[PDB]
């Protein structure tokens, strides 16, 4: 094929020996670098959302349907049949009250929680890996209670002992009924990031039998928004499935000024990624257009020799296709390698110390890479190949259009 031969010869060096010109190799390297940086940035960005609703948002409840009239309003039959709407698929009930731990140690105040055994795993992500495996199977009878690294740490014992919290101030009504349920041992302990281990305690559901709470009707909970961001204020025109008495409590926006940080960070992320894309595209386009303009002289000779538009188009199409293909292959390989094996690159300059990028980051990840390939690398490769072909094509058409003798003399 004539076009391929001419393109290859144009992409050849100025001197015998090396079969690669400086400009072609340079454009290849630029395209590869752009593709690699785009891949890395997109992978980190996607990992951001992958981790956000996995270790910092799942633990916090996504909503609440608490009302001032539980019986038959928020507690019709077993519960409000909020499962009808397809937004969520695990409602479960929810009972909350406060108490104190009595162990002859640093007393702490805990807002305890009620959780149903063989349940609460479809609801939130608080159930986490811990030595106390099969703990839920041991949760029953309203006797044993599970705490975090809170009052357990404050007290000088762990699961190895059986010290009871002895809630002394369980007063649902202001009058001091104070039913002191004592000898509630703990056999499992959980750990969470940072704080709020000080105010977590697991009580089997339907604990009202002995805690003097009224009946089996509790506050309840719902609205486990899977697409929390897209579900933001999505309860508008919805949520009537609950048929509660008073306006339900809000979604995770109730603990505001952290969701604000989340949204602001996401905005800055989008801005930075847009800047990356623009810079890389500009670099690639500038290099390709400069090279093609540098190769404008021979186009006039070909046109005056009788070359048609098709051959001129095909020559630079092949040139750009070759450059883009090789650069995209190299960039894809390097970027995939980096993204898949970036976090495992822990600098051993200081033995498990410092690294200048890891400090006080436990239960989170120093970096956050996630390679959602076969749907994102394809876009980058297609965009690179396009940009390359368009940059190759545009100046070639202009040079061919110009009177051949005119450009041979002027440029």
């Amino acid at each position: 094929p004539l076009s391929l031969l001419i393109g290859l010869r144009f992409s050849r060096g100025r001197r015998r020996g090396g079969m690669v010109s400086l400009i072609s190799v340079i454009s290849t390297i630029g395209i590869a670098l752009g593709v690699a940086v785009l891949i890395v940035g997109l992978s980190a960005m996607n990992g951001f959302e992958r981790e956000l609703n996995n270790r910092i948002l799942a633990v916090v409840p996504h909503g609440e349907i608490e009302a001032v009239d539980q019986p038959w309003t928020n507690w019709q039959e077993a519960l409000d049949h909020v499962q009808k709407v397809p937004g969520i698929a695990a409602a479960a009930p929810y009972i909350n009250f406060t108490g104190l731990v009595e162990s002859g140690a640093n007393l702490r105040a805990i807002q305890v929680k009620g959780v149903n055994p063989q349940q609460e795993q479809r609801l939130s992500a608080l159930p986490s890996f811990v030595q106390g495996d099969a703990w839920r199977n041991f949760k029953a009878g309203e006797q044993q209670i599970i705490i975090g690294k809170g009052v357990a740490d404050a007290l000088k014992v762990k699961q190895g002992d059986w010290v009871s919290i002895m809630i002394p101030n369980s007063n649902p009504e202001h009058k001091l009924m104070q039913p002191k349920r004592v000898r509630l041992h703990v056999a499992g302990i959980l750990q969470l990031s940072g704080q709020l281990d000080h105010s977590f305690a697991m009580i089997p559901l339907a604990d009202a039998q002995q805690y003097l709470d009224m009946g089996s009707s509790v506050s309840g909970i719902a609205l486990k928004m899977t697409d929390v961001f897209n579900a933001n204020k999505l309860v508008r025109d919805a949520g009537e499935v609950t048929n509660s008495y008073v306006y339900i409590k809000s979604w995770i926006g109730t603990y505001g000024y952290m969701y604000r940080d989340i949204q602001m960070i996401r905005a800055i992320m989008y801005l930075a990624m847009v800047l990356v894309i623009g810079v890389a595209c500009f670099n690639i386009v500038s290099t390709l257009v400069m090279a093609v303009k540098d190769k404008s002289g021979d186009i006039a000779v070909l046109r005056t020799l009788g070359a048609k538009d098709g051959l001129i188009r095909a020559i630079f199409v092949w040139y750009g296709l070759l450059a883009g293909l090789f650069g995209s292959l190299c960039g894809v390989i390097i970027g995939v390698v980096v993204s898949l094996q970036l976090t495992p690159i822990i600098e051993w300059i200081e033995k498990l110390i410092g690294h200048q990028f890891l400090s006080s980051d436990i239960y989170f990840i120093d970096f956050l890479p996630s390679e959602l390939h076969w749907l994102d690398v394809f876009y980058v490769l297609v965009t690179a190949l396009l940009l390359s072909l368009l940059a190759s094509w545009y100046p070639a058409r202009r040079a061919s259009n110009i009177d051949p003798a005119r450009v041979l003399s002027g440029q």
Partner: protein
């Protein structure tokens, strides 16, 4: 009996500084199988004229008719059609593809016509031997000396047997050897093949080989050669 046709072919270059006129109402004709020679002083406007004759510079207030059809008339595809089988243009300060050796450069009109591998090679070498630099068929223009590249350009022009051959000082960078020999070559071409020639040259000893040597006179081509 007509190949070239000029009707007041005027031109002027002006980028916004001054009006630098070149030509004033050029008009002549080159008969089928007719030779002509152009003479004049530097700066007259010969090269610009011959560029206008082809479809390689837009005339200002004139037109050129080839085989009863103007040049701006031809579409881009039609002009590409024409340049392969009817144009034998040679370039002053001749420009060659630098990454292609002499053989490929000579063969390019045929490759563009897609003649044949074997025919193309044989005929490129045909014309190269005609010009007479067989021992530089493997040298790129960079490695070629000053004159052999000019002969390569001539061979490329005449490889495809064009009907008309426009030239810009085909033999001005060469000794008498290649000047005289290449005039012999063109002379046989015309009387063996019905090809016309129109060559601009400064060597007045052989300028009259074309006969009817015109004189470019800073606009209009004076019939005589009275300086």
């Amino acid at each position: 009996k007509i190949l070239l046709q000029c009707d007041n072919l005027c031109k002027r270059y002006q980028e916004g500084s001054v009006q630098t006129d070149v030509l004033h109402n050029v008009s002549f004709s080159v008969g089928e199988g007719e030779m002509m020679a152009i003479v004049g002083s530097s700066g007259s406007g010969k090269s610009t004229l011959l560029h206008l004759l082809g479809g390689l510079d837009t005339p200002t207030s004139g037109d050129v008719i080839f085989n009863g059809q103007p040049m701006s008339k031809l579409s881009s595809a039609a002009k590409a059609e024409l340049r392969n089988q009817k144009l034998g243009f040679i370039y002053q300060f001749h420009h060659l593809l630098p990454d292609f050796t002499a053989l490929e450069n000579v063969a390019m009109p045929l490759l563009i016509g897609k003649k044949k591998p074997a025919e193309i090679n044989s005929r490129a070498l045909e014309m190269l031997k005609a010009v007479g630099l067989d021992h530089r068929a493997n040298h790129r223009p960079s490695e070629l000396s000053g004159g052999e590249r000019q002969r390569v350009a001539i061979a490329r022009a005449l490889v495809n047997n064009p009907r008309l051959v426009l030239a810009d000082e085909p033999t001005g960078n060469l000794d008498a050897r290649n000047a005289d020999s290449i005039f012999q070559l063109l002379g046989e071409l015309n009387r063996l093949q019905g090809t016309a020639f129109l060559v601009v040259t400064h060597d007045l000893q052989l300028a009259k080989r074309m006969s009817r040597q015109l004189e470019m006179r800073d606009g209009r081509l004076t019939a005589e050669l009275s300086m």
